[PDB]
Design a protein around this ligand. Structure first.
Ligand SMILES: *[C@@H]1O[C@H](CO)[C@@H](O)[C@H](O)[C@H]1NC(C)=O
Ligand SMILES: *[C@@H]1O[C@H](CO)[C@@H](O)[C@H](O)[C@H]1NC(C)=O
Ligand SMILES: *[C@@H]1O[C@H](CO)[C@@H](O)[C@H](O)[C@H]1NC(C)=O
Ligand SMILES: *[C@@H]1O[C@H](CO)[C@@H](O)[C@H](O)[C@H]1NC(C)=O
Ligand SMILES: *[C@@H]1O[C@H](CO)[C@@H](O)[C@H](O)[C@H]1NC(C)=O
Ligand SMILES: *[C@@H]1O[C@H](CO)[C@@H](O)[C@H](O)[C@H]1NC(C)=O
Ligand SMILES: *[C@@H]1O[C@H](CO)[C@@H](O)[C@H](O)[C@H]1NC(C)=O
Ligand SMILES: *[C@@H]1O[C@H](CO)[C@@H](O)[C@H](O)[C@H]1NC(C)=O
Lengths: 128, 404, 187
């Protein structure tokens, strides 16, 4: 949330100013160069901008695409029928459990003191 | 009773998908410019880190929701230019060229009806322009290609011909569509008009999320002003009116009190996020099944028999149009489980026997279409004596004239 | 890891380790110092439990999903689009993983394609004929009926099609000859 005009006043060594600077709705982005092309999102920035490392190698930031584009051939008397097929295999990953942790609150708070217990019974049920 | 007419109905369903991504700096909330506030806070340690490890957990989840409802497809489909859909006039729900954002009319009619001390609001990853682009592809896919673009590459088919398959999935024979194409289209185009009316009048599921996620921040900022039992609520006053060797206890109280309020607000965030996640998954499954397919799941895709759906975008949420088939205008009939012929018991292959007391006929279950009983509508599997409710009659044979 | 590091925080008590205080100070002064560590430690413990309850509540939803997916994808085929993997679904084989389960979905996918002309119905002896299951396609000269998902043409028999009403009403229709396979043999 900083206009690029204000950024130098806090300063990292090179990037105080005098460098590639790119204002975006997400903010002021510095040290990377804007490009007119569009690609898939390598790393997200925000508000439709993504950044990537590219080959001279440099960091570039660009308006992400939504993938490719094509038309569909539509007429009111024509149809397309598949003539061949392929079988395919895919893997889906699901988590099912996590570790059975258990904790002894009396040991944790008080170690082996008795007096720390004699205080703890002021607080009642919590360690139950 | 067998129905003899039908009404196509369009019904509306509304779901939330994302809450606003937000963040807080633990130190700028708790302290002013006080260094000693910071140095006393350094006695409590790690809490000011966990509070960001918590909130950043929510912030990324709010991407992966909107990412996963909508991006079922990777191929932006153009609409065909010529609006030949056999009488259906989707011009309400498609995009249009002229608007300054390419939202449809039904989306713009919708968009209108919805309304610092370290508090920071982070923009979403997707824009409302990108969202409205995706849905235009799901409309273009379903109108031109049926389900097939979900299963694989998109196979074009005429719209007035795919509707025959969608009717076939509910046990109605294709002749019932092709003999009536004009009437059905008029029922559809009429029902879209009622949606524009009803929408013009209702977004409570969406609207109250915007309410609560403001109201909690208002509670959090008001909670700065409390004394918490300290002598005053301004740190400069504490540090001036009393010496640090004793103003320490006032600061320590006011930090403890303020901290508790942040430690509550972060949980009141998390427990809501855990409900929005369940809503995003329900919306995802509704889109995967009711839009990219046709689902038999009773009342899962709106009331009635399901035919097809169209998605429409909304702020923080999504809206569906469910198009459904409703039977009406029925007549009573006499029926029998089976027909007895030349001593042998006939059963229908698919339909059911009815009689108007005067003649006997067979007809499909869901739309009255009586036919002559033939040995091609029926199959035979026993004597007549064994089955209850059998009725004597005669079965016509189309191979009988074929004696010549 | 965070919970163990929290033992070192002093919460404004004189020292992190209680034994330092409980050695160097007498009870009536220790008992107003140790009182602070207990409040600081409890609140760090309380926060931990409130986190575990929510992660448990969300994993429970993932385990409950997996049991739904196993019953509806392994013990049977299921037609819910995109539920048992992308494409048309044939079968799935489960495999185990540390704290998890991993599926293999087997799916059929239609591939190569060709364009054809098609018409809702055939108009015959003034009578319309409709296909029982497939769809009529022409290669630009002859007319066939074929199953929908895989091109395999057949002649327009009296037995693939059925009749219902005249040619007058159907919007799109092409005049064409239906074949009776009995016509020679019936002599
Ligand atoms: C940044 O400051 C300049 C000069 O005031 C102004 O013209 C510009 O609109 C500002 N941009 C933003 C992002 O506020
Ligand atoms: C398609 O629509 C055009 C214009 O209405 C019409 O001339 C043509 O006959 C139609 N074709 C079929 C087979 O539906
Ligand atoms: C179908 O694909 C298989 C496997 O690639 C290939 O062997 C076969 O020739 C193809 N058949 C047709 C009709 O294209
Ligand atoms: C069925 O409903 C439609 C639309 O109201 C109407 O035009 C038609 O005449 C009705 N037919 C019967 C069987 O009443
Ligand atoms: C139908 O029910 C009536 C009354 O129970 C009985 O008399 C008659 O025999 C039954 N007929 C059939 C079809 O079983
Ligand atoms: C049908 O005819 C047979 C032979 O006359 C008779 O035994 C039987 O009761 C009749 N059943 C009915 C339903 O009339
Ligand atoms: C259509 O298929 C038939 C198959 O017998 C063939 O004889 C005919 O030449 C084909 N016509 C065209 C235009 O492909
Ligand atoms: C079929 O034949 C009839 C009678 O000659 C004619 O009116 C109709 O236009 C023809 N249709 C086609 C598609 O050739």
């Amino acid at each position: 949330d900083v206009n690029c005009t204000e950024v130098p006043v806090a300063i990292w060594r090179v990037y105080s100013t005098g460098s590639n600077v790119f204002q975006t709705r997400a903010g002021c982005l510095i040290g990377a160069e804007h490009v007119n092309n569009s690609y898939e999102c390598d790393i997200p920035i925000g508000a439709g901008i993504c950044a990537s490392y590219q080959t001279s190698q440099s960091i570039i930031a660009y308006t992400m695409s939504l993938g490719a584009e094509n038309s569909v051939a539509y007429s009111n008397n024509s149809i397309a029928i598949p003539t061949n097929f392929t079988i395919s295999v895919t893997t889906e990953i699901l988590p099912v459990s996590m570790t059975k942790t258990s904790v002894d609150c009396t040991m944790y708070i008080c170690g082996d003191s008795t007096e720390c217990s004699n205080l703890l019974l002021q607080y009642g049920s919590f360690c139950t | 009773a067998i129905p003899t007419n039908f009404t196509i109905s369009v019904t509306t369903e509304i779901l939330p998908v994302s809450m606003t991504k937000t963040s807080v700096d633990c130190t700028m909330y708790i302290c002013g410019d006080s260094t000693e506030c910071s140095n006393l806070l350094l006695q409590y340690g790690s809490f000011c880190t966990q509070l960001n490890r918590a909130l950043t957990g929510i912030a990324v989840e709010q991407d992966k929701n909107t990412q996963e409802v909508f991006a079922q497809v990777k191929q932006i489909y153009k609409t065909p230019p010529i609006k030949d859909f056999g009488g259906f006039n989707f011009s309400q729900i498609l995009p249009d060229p002229s608007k300054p954002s390419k939202r449809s009319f039904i989306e713009d009619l919708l968009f209108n009806k919805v309304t610092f001390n370290g508090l920071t609001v982070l923009p979403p990853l997707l824009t409302d322009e990108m969202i409205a682009q995706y849905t235009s592809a799901l409309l273009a896919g379903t109108i031109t290609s049926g389900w097939t673009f979900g299963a694989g590459a998109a196979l074009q088919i005429p719209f007035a011909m795919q509707m025959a398959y969608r009717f076939n999935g509910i046990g109605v024979t294709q002749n019932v569509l092709y003999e009536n194409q004009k009437l059905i289209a008029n029922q559809f185009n009429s029902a879209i008009g009622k949606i524009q009316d009803s929408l013009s009048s209702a977004l409570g599921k969406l609207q109250d999320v915007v309410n609560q996620n403001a109201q909690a921040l208002n509670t959090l900022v008001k909670q700065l002003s409390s004394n918490f039992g300290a002598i005053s609520s301004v740190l400069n006053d504490i540090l001036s009116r009393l010496d640090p060797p004793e103003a320490e206890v006032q600061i320590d109280r006011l930090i403890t009190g303020r901290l508790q309020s942040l430690q509550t607000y972060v949980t009141q965030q998390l427990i809501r996020a855990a409900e929005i996640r369940a809503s995003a998954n329900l919306a995802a499954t509704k889109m995967s099944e009711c839009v990219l397919g046709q689902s038999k799941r009773v009342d899962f895709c709106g009331k009635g028999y399901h035919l097809m759906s169209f998605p429409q975008s909304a702020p923080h949420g999504v809206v569906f149009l469910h198009v459904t088939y409703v039977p009406a205008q029925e007549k009573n009939f006499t029926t029998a489980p089976a027909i007895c012929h030349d001593g042998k018991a006939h059963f229908p292959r698919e339909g059911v026997f009815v009689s108007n007391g005067t003649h006997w006929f067979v007809t499909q279950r869901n739309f009255y279409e009586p036919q002559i009983i033939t040995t091609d509508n029926t199959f035979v599997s026993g004597n007549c004596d064994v089955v209850i409710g059998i009725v004597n009659n005669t079965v016509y044979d189309p191979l009988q004239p074929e004696l010549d």
